[model samples]
Target: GDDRRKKAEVIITELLDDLEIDLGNESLRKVLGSYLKKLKNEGTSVPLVLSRMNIEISNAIKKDGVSLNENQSKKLKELMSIS
Candidate 1:
């Protein structure tokens, strides 16, 4: 279980790096930052924010012809309670 969890963490980290590489175009950061600020102001739970972030990233990766491994997706969904 620990190894699996560690692998998921690494996958997520890589996914984040990929997103920064692909979508780090100027305005996207501001837009996402604004959304984060809004979410913070709205008192969103950290877990909910993380879940939303993961789904957004997953969608982006899918569009880029890259896909998350099943275990990565599973861990994210389990954390977020997304179906």
Candidate 2:
């Protein structure tokens, strides 16, 4: 669990770094930073965070010409403990 948590933190840190540049908005950065801190305290797992990121990015990509593939769907389902 500790390892998982650490990995989640790293993943979140990377995501935040990207968002900081991609958003380029102080308010959004602050809000996202606060949310990331809250998520850190909530005991996030790497798999959980990865699954969530996958879903979010998939949704974003769907607005374009792509969508989540079967492997991603399977992985997300497994990680989320969905039947």
Where in model 1 is the C-alpha error above 4 Å?
A: 1-44
Query: Which 10-residue span in candidate 1 carries the lowest summed lDDT?
Result: 23-32
Candidate 2 residues lying further than 4 Å off, grouped into runs, are: 23-35, 43-46, 61-83
Model 1's TM-score against the true structure: 0.35
Cα lDDT tens digits for candidate 1, 6-42? 3434444443444353443323333344344544465
Candidate 1 local accuracy as lDDT?
0.46
lDDT of 1 at 42: 55
Candidate 1 lDDT at 76 equals 44
Cα RMSDs of all predictions? 7.3, 7.3
Q: Estimate candidate 2's RMSD in Å.
A: 7.3
